[PDB]
Design an enzyme around this catalytic site. Structure first.
Site, PDB file in Angstrom:
ATOM      1  CG  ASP A  94       5.600  -0.257 -10.027  1.00 58.73           C
ATOM      2  OD1 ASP A  94       5.789  -0.203  -8.895  1.00 58.73           O
ATOM      3  OD2 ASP A  94       5.702  -0.114 -11.294  1.00 58.73           O
ATOM      4  CG  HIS A  95       6.114   0.484  -4.308  1.00 58.50           C
ATOM      5  ND1 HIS A  95       6.993  -0.281  -3.232  1.00 58.50           N
ATOM      6  CD2 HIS A  95       6.413  -0.409  -5.965  1.00 58.50           C
ATOM      7  CE1 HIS A  95       7.766  -0.964  -3.981  1.00 58.50           C
ATOM      8  NE2 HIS A  95       7.548  -1.732  -4.896  1.00 58.50           N
ATOM      9  CG  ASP A  96       0.265   6.488  -4.855  1.00 56.84           C
ATOM     10  OD1 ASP A  96      -0.728   6.056  -4.988  1.00 56.84           O
ATOM     11  OD2 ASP A  96       0.513   7.643  -4.444  1.00 56.84           O
TER      12      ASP A  96
END
Ligand SMILES: *[C@@H]1O[C@H](CO[C@@H]2O[C@@H](C)[C@@H](O)[C@@H](O)[C@@H]2O)[C@@H](O[C@@H]2O[C@H](CO)[C@@H](O[C@@H]3O[C@H](CO[C@H]4O[C@H](CO)[C@@H](O)[C@H](O)[C@@H]4O)[C@@H](O)[C@H](O[C@H]4O[C@H](CO)[C@@H](O)[C@H](O)[C@@H]4O)[C@@H]3O)[C@H](O)[C@H]2NC(C)=O)[C@H](O)[C@H]1NC(C)=O
Ligand SMILES: *[C@@H]1O[C@H](CO[C@@H]2O[C@@H](C)[C@@H](O)[C@@H](O)[C@@H]2O)[C@@H](O[C@@H]2O[C@H](CO)[C@@H](O[C@@H]3O[C@H](CO[C@H]4O[C@H](CO)[C@@H](O)[C@H](O)[C@@H]4O)[C@@H](O)[C@H](O[C@H]4O[C@H](CO)[C@@H](O)[C@H](O)[C@@H]4O)[C@@H]3O)[C@H](O)[C@H]2NC(C)=O)[C@H](O)[C@H]1NC(C)=O
Ligand code: HEM
Ligand code: HEM
Ligand SMILES: *[C@@H]1O[C@H](CO)[C@@H](O[C@@H]2O[C@H](CO)[C@@H](O)[C@H](O)[C@H]2NC(C)=O)[C@H](O)[C@H]1NC(C)=O
Ligand SMILES: *[C@@H]1O[C@H](CO)[C@@H](O)[C@H](O)[C@H]1NC(C)=O
Ligand SMILES: *[C@@H]1O[C@H](CO)[C@@H](O)[C@H](O)[C@H]1NC(C)=O
Ligand SMILES: *[C@@H]1O[C@H](CO)[C@@H](O)[C@H](O)[C@H]1NC(C)=O
Ligand SMILES: [Br-]
Ligand SMILES: [Br-]
Ligand SMILES: [Br-]
Ligand SMILES: [Br-]
Ligand SMILES: [Br-]
Ligand SMILES: [Br-]
Ligand SMILES: [Br-]
Ligand SMILES: [Br-]
Ligand SMILES: [Br-]
Ligand SMILES: [Br-]
Ligand SMILES: [Br-]
Ligand SMILES: [Br-]
Ligand SMILES: [Br-]
Ligand SMILES: [Br-]
Ligand SMILES: [Br-]
Ligand SMILES: [Br-]
Ligand SMILES: [Br-]
Ligand SMILES: [Br-]
Ligand SMILES: [Br-]
Ligand SMILES: [Br-]
Ligand SMILES: [Br-]
Ligand SMILES: [Br-]
Ligand SMILES: [Br-]
Ligand SMILES: [Br-]
Ligand SMILES: [Br-]
Ligand SMILES: [Br-]
Ligand SMILES: [Br-]
Ligand SMILES: [Br-]
Ligand SMILES: [Br-]
Ligand SMILES: [Br-]
Ligand SMILES: [Br-]
Ligand SMILES: [Br-]
Ligand SMILES: [Br-]
Ligand SMILES: [Br-]
Ligand SMILES: [Br-]
Ligand SMILES: [Br-]
Ligand SMILES: [Br-]
Ligand SMILES: [Br-]
Ligand SMILES: [Br-]
Ligand SMILES: [Br-]
Ligand SMILES: [Br-]
Ligand SMILES: [Br-]
Ligand SMILES: [Br-]
Ligand SMILES: [Br-]
Ligand SMILES: [Br-]
Ligand SMILES: [Br-]
Ligand SMILES: [Br-]
Ligand SMILES: [Br-]
Ligand SMILES: [Br-]
Ligand SMILES: [Br-]
Ligand SMILES: [Br-]
Ligand SMILES: [Br-]
Ligand SMILES: [Br-]
Ligand SMILES: [Br-]
Ligand SMILES: [Br-]
Ligand SMILES: [Br-]
Ligand SMILES: [Ca+2]
Ligand SMILES: [Ca+2]
Lengths: 105, 465, 69, 105, 465, 70
Positions: A94-96
């Site tokens: 998600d943090h990509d």
């Protein structure tokens, strides 16, 4: 955009040469469906006391959490067929993909 | 009005109000803090408000490298030509690198163990310290970059720093793609949905829009139902580690001190491989460590992550459950009976109708995670549609997708297909025993474990020049 | 920029970073090669810091101990 | 939006009760495709001298008109099976659908 | 920078540059004036620039009634309770009403016949004076409203003005819908495309987005290829009318004086019924009355409407021909050969590739109008897709569509199905001889003409209350 | 609103309209019913013109002859 390149840009600019902001950082999300706001264009449902959505009161999000989401933790059900790494890869991934900024104080 | 300390509803604050008989928050004049997401066009009374993604939508390992050119440089080791990412200069983990420290004026990591005086970490994404399990994954990939750059410099000595960095980054990026699409997503969607939403890759399609859809920021939060209430740590026998083997999650948020002083990333990664995830069940959706005590150590009041999810979807103007069902080509229940049929659970339907009055108003996360799970998947049909469609777009609309002709040589593709997260762990930690494929399903020690020796390393010989 | 989530400032690019102090050591190392230092001067000049007095001064303002300089 | 109404609003607001700006006046067009601009986000192709589109010079619109659109008027072909009222209803109808504003002098 | 009197490219001017060997504009330091459309979010470096629709997308006859509450009121006769639209107070057309005059400080209609001192008209849309044939259509609908309101007051004496206005408006709106969808669009798209893009109406669908797409503002300009170089006027024998029977178009732009002083709307309507449109052919796209002398009477230089078309599509950031082909599910030519096949015309293909270099860059209007026409339609398959798709959305996404359950009674629907443009002309003008169905295909006097007596009037008995 | 197309002002709502002069005559007609006049006063007051002197004076500024009210 340069005519020829070998590596990705950091920002993601120029990935798509015809519309080179697509997938780049600091751009609006795409909308797959028209937004639904209290006033048509900016106020979230729940904002104005006594304003319904589609004919029904807006449920407090914390009420929905309390009544639907809460459970006794000692009754937790392990997933026989998934590791906790499956949780953690999801968050890393998600943090990509997305970070939605908010104003600071 | 400071939205963090104030309960007045004034832009940009949209505080969550407290219900009458709340189990934890007795005081109904209190509230859960909430800042509305930054609008694309602030102050417009022409545009329909929309929000901003600050990251590259592509699966490009931007959590490692950053999504903006100042951060991206700041993450690099600029004292030499080795193409390395910057590492901590004060601390090491039994000789291996840690992430550098970030410098915030108001640093939440320092508020966890006050006396330990350990600040938050710096990485390509700014949320790297949020839980130490996440930190460990970031740290792993930091090390993998530098290992690759080191091996490449050895293989191609005349390559300068810029070149080493790019090539390593390009490899790390493909590794994230492969792990995601080959190993992770099939276990998210289940086989039926995987074949429907992610058919076999053909080639780059320059007409596919690769942006993140607004709804995906909420839908992909399905992962909150997987979260366990503890951080588990294990020694090199995969036994509990005796400086607190099972820390409650509400004491690990921003707890960067745990990584630096309580034994590095090895125990944390062991914990992740050898502990099960939580199962999403319709009566056991999410735990109180995130529903009651989110971030309680760094902030005036514990948050409610599920509730935040729902307030956020309204902040973003997202349509309700039935609208997303229709978008996906799925039947739309109108009555409590029909909703019961869709959920295979009349009781839950009744509870949802009592809250919301119509299935049209159910917030996307809540309806999404309420749906019964697809066979061998961990989401229902609605979430599988949204998440499937998103990752299809990210793949077919990515000109640097690892299998796209021209990105890598045939030889390089052959060699990339050998990579796995277990191996990466062997290469960059003190762990010598790791999960069998598939790492995301394997969860029980020692039944599901193998020695690092049995796993093939990534062969970089076709990167020689 | 300032990246913010739930009222918590999670990064600010304005700020000097602790690992950049090791770059100050390379600039003052008399036996470090002149190309390495030039590359670092360029790194710090891209950030608007042109002398070592301007570099050390920015580290100090951002809360670091610079007393060994 | 009122729960009950009998006639259209002048502006078109509330025609769609879930997203009540849809079809209403003084709103952005919807995009069926991502926009294609010189710089990714606002400058039209042709703006900056020497900047190509997808590897080719941008053609002066007046050049395209001269070379492709121009014909000798004495050669005009009357349509056996369409009246000039067919032209005119299209313009009248267009003026029910869209007016794209511009700045004045 | 005044974009009208300067050739400097500075926001908001995007002047069209002049090629070396131009048939009309000798001086290459001159330009064709062009103002960029207003952006939705002015000054943003986050948003992708987009433009604004000032009108209601719905086919609601907003060209008659306005799309904003000040104009909408100003158009109404406020001196009584009869629910009438305001009419000219200085002039009449053999006893029948004319549009009221608008008041502009720099009025372009005054600049046509300087001595006549006849200003532009006021209507629901601001472009009502642009050519007198358009003015006549606006005038016709003005009168139809007032005739309806008058008949309804007679039928329902206790109705107040607000009630009369709304009911008449609601009728006029349905009449525009019926004429457009039953009579007009089938002759635009041809039967195959009509059945594909506009299948038989089912019911209002609240999930259909009814907004105008940016591309439609350009694509629907296909109509520019239909324009004849003259305004034709005919007497009551359908013979040429001798105060100039065939005025060149470059002397009718904003020529409101022609309506008031040169014989009203009757001759103009006769001209429209009994004169053929121009045919779009690949070597005869658009005439020089709009390509060389657009608006030349009211402005420093004659514009080039086709060229404006193309500059505007770039202003609006519209993708090129192949991208819209793909959007529509049509083959996308890459070579000049393939484009020759698509256009059934290699010569035109060669000319397009010489201008643009690739079919990917061809401006949507130019590609669109270059395509061979569908059988019994007046657009090619690309334009038929865009225009079809747009009108489907306007129909299925309109809560007040005339056939939608509850909008009209079954009796009222039955009576509305008898309406036609010829009848409206009989009811509101001094014309007693009008085209046979279909008015838009019928074009030759007297072969294609009938007496007004033969046409059934609209029966308002089911509006009694 | 000022609506503008190709550098040509096509409408401006700021400006008094010729047909509104006939409304001034209804207001001065002594034998016209008081409900009709109230409606018109409200119409002109919604536009920010509160007296007949303010109405006539706005028509003048916008180019009309108002000498026939003297
Ligand atoms: C009421 O109108 C709704 C709108 O319908 C459209 O507009 C009208 C005017 C007609 O032209 C109509 O035919 C149009 O479709 C209508 O809902 C629409 O329903 C369709 C069909 O169910 C939905 O399409 C599906 O979409 C999903 C998601 O992907 C879409 O979005 C992304 C991004 O925008 C794109 O990348 C995709 O290409 C899609 O367009 C797809 O998963 C799905 O395809 C897959 O599943 C089907 C079904 O098994 C398979 O056959 C396919 O091969 C795929 O595997 C469809 O493409 C559409 O999203 C939805 N839109 C809205 C606004 O909800 C509704 O049904 C109408 N109701 C009635 C009763 O008429
Ligand atoms: C490269 O990718 C392109 C985009 O692909 C989408 O995303 C990828 C990841 C896949 O999931 C893919 O399946 C997705 O579509 C792709 O271009 C696309 O091709 C389709 C099919 O040709 C196009 O759909 C057609 O759309 C037109 C226009 O209407 C659409 O848009 C309006 C407004 O947004 C909506 O209201 C509509 O509901 C549609 O979504 C339709 O007229 C048409 O349908 C009609 O005809 C078919 C066939 O006869 C009938 O089945 C229908 O019922 C209708 O009568 C299609 O729905 C799509 O617009 C287009 N997208 C873009 C962005 O161009 C491309 O083909 C890929 N190329 C390769 C080589 O793989
Ligand atoms: C230890 C695990 C996780 C958290 C702690 C955590 C927390 C958050 C918070 C605080 C937000 C912001 C909520 C708000 O609206 O105010 C949040 C958003 C998002 N998540 Fe969370 N999350 C943890 C774990 C996961 C996992 C396992 C996820 C998926 C598999 C996951 C997803 C997301 C996503 C996509 C968001 C939105 C991100 C954005 O800013 O666009 N998270 N999470
Ligand atoms: C007498 C006949 C016609 C004109 C005179 C005329 C003129 C214009 C002009 C000047 C524009 C603006 C050009 C620009 O981009 O600067 C314009 C735009 C549009 N047209 Fe034209 N037009 C005449 C006739 C027709 C017919 C028959 C049409 C369709 C059948 C038609 C369409 C349109 C449309 C939709 C536009 C765009 C409008 C917008 O503002 O959104 N026209 N026309
Ligand atoms: C807070 O952090 C300190 C470290 O600064 C922790 O103290 C250490 O605890 C371990 C295990 O009990 C000892 O072996 C160390 O010698 C301790 N170090 C010091 C300097 O005291 C402390 O336990 C942490 N507190 C919490 C809340 O767990
Ligand atoms: C850069 O790399 C060198 C050599 O590995 C190392 O000694 C130094 O600590 C690194 N610098 C930073 C800030 O990462
Ligand atoms: C309003 O209607 C009356 C009666 O039909 C007419 O005499 C009068 O002139 C009209 N005024 C306007 C401005 O239309
Ligand atoms: C201009 O209008 C007058 C009437 O005012 C008319 O007699 C004359 O013929 C017109 N002139 C032109 C140029 O047609
Ligand atoms: Br870059
Ligand atoms: Br969305
Ligand atoms: Br929207
Ligand atoms: Br939208
Ligand atoms: Br409980
Ligand atoms: Br306060
Ligand atoms: Br706000
Ligand atoms: Br409550
Ligand atoms: Br409390
Ligand atoms: Br918008
Ligand atoms: Br290391
Ligand atoms: Br602690
Ligand atoms: Br987070
Ligand atoms: Br390089
Ligand atoms: Br893969
Ligand atoms: Br699978
Ligand atoms: Br499926
Ligand atoms: Br797409
Ligand atoms: Br250990
Ligand atoms: Br603690
Ligand atoms: Br818990
Ligand atoms: Br706080
Ligand atoms: Br719905
Ligand atoms: Br159902
Ligand atoms: Br039950
Ligand atoms: Br249950
Ligand atoms: Br499974
Ligand atoms: Br399973
Ligand atoms: Br499914
Ligand atoms: Br081990
Ligand atoms: Br294995
Ligand atoms: Br694996
Ligand atoms: Br090994
Ligand atoms: Br609105
Ligand atoms: Br568009
Ligand atoms: Br866009
Ligand atoms: Br878009
Ligand atoms: Br060029
Ligand atoms: Br501009
Ligand atoms: Br945007
Ligand atoms: Br009349
Ligand atoms: Br003249
Ligand atoms: Br016009
Ligand atoms: Br119809
Ligand atoms: Br037909
Ligand atoms: Br739609
Ligand atoms: Br030709
Ligand atoms: Br001509
Ligand atoms: Br293309
Ligand atoms: Br025909
Ligand atoms: Br034909
Ligand atoms: Br065809
Ligand atoms: Br019927
Ligand atoms: Br006649
Ligand atoms: Br007809
Ligand atoms: Br008038
Ligand atoms: Ca990314
Ligand atoms: Ca309209």
């Amino acid at each position: 955009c340069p005519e020829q390149d070998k590596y990705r840009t950091i920002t993601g600019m120029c990935n798509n040469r015809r519309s080179p902001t697509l997938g780049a950082s600091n751009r609006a999300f795409v909308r797959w469906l028209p937004a639904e706001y209290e006033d048509g264009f900016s106020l979230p449902y729940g904002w104005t006391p006594g304003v319904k959505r589609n004919g029904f009161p807006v449920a407090l999000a914390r009420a929905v959490s309390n009544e639907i989401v809460r459970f006794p933790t000692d009754q937790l059900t392990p997933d026989q067929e998934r590791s906790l790494m499956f949780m953690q890869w999801g968050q890393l991934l998600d943090h990509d993909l997305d970070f939605t900024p908010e104003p600071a104080a | 009005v400071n939205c963090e300390t104030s309960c007045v509803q004034q832009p940009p604050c949209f505080p969550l109000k407290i219900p009458p008989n709340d189990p934890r928050i007795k005081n109904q004049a209190d509230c859960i803090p909430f800042f509305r997401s930054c609008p694309a066009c602030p102050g417009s009374n022409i545009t329909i408000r929309n929000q901003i993604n600050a990251l590259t939508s592509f699966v490009d390992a931007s959590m490692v490298y950053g999504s903006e050119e100042p951060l991206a440089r700041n993450l690099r080791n600029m004292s030499n030509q080795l193409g390395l990412l910057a590492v901590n200069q004060r601390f090491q983990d039994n000789g291996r690198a840690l992430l550098p420290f970030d410098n915030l004026h108001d640093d939440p990591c320092l508020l966890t163990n006050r006396s330990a005086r350990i600040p938050c970490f710096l990485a390509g994404d700014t949320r790297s310290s949020e839980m130490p399990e996440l930190t460990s994954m970031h740290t792993l990939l930091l090390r993998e970059h530098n290992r690759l750059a080191t091996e490449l410099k050895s293989l191609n000595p005349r390559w300068d720093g810029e070149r080493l960095y790019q090539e390593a980054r390009k490899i790390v990026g493909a590794m994230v793609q492969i792990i995601t699409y080959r190993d992770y997503l099939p276990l998210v969607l289940g086989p039926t949905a995987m074949r429907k939403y992610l058919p076999t890759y053909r080639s780059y399609n320059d007409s596919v829009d690769p942006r993140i859809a607004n709804v995906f920021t909420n839908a992909f939060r399905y992962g909150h139902t997987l979260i366990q209430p503890f951080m588990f740590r294990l020694d090199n026998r995969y036994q509990p580690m005796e400086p607190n083997p099972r820390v409650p999650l509400s004491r690990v948020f921003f707890a960067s001190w745990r990584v630096v002083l309580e034994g590095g990333i090895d125990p944390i990664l062991r914990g992740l491989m050898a502990t099960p995830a939580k199962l999403n069940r319709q009566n056991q959706i999410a735990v109180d460590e995130i529903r009651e005590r989110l971030f309680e150590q760094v902030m005036r009041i514990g948050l409610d992550l599920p509730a935040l999810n729902m307030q956020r979807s309204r902040d973003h103007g997202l349509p309700g459950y039935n609208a997303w069902r229709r978008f996906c080509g799925l039947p739309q229940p109108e009555t409590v009976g029909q909703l019961g049929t869709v959920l295979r659970n009349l009781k839950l339907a009744r509870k949802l109708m009592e809250q919301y009055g119509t299935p049209n108003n159910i917030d996307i996360w809540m309806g999404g995670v309420s749906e019964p799970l697809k066979r061998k998947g961990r989401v229902g049909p609605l979430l599988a549609c949204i998440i499937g469609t998103q990752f299809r777009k990210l793949r077919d609309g990515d000109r640097f997708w690892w299998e796209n002709e021209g990105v890598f040589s045939m030889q390089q593709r052959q060699a990339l297909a050998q990579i796995s997260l277990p191996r990466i762990i062997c290469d960059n930690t003190g762990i010598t025993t790791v999960s069998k494929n598939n790492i995301f399903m394997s969860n029980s020690y020692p039944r599901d474990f193998v020695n690092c020796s049995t796993l093939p390393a990534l062969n970089l010989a076709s990167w020689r020049e | 920029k300032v990246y913010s989530q739930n009222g918590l400032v999670l990064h600010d690019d304005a700020n000097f970073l602790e690992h950049e102090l090791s770059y100050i050591d390379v600039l003052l190392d008399k036996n470090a090669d002149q190309a390495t230092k030039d590359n670092l001067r360029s790194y710090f000049a891209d950030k608007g810091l042109h002398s070592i007095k301007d570099i050390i001064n920015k580290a100090k303002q951002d809360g670091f101990d610079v007393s060994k300089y």
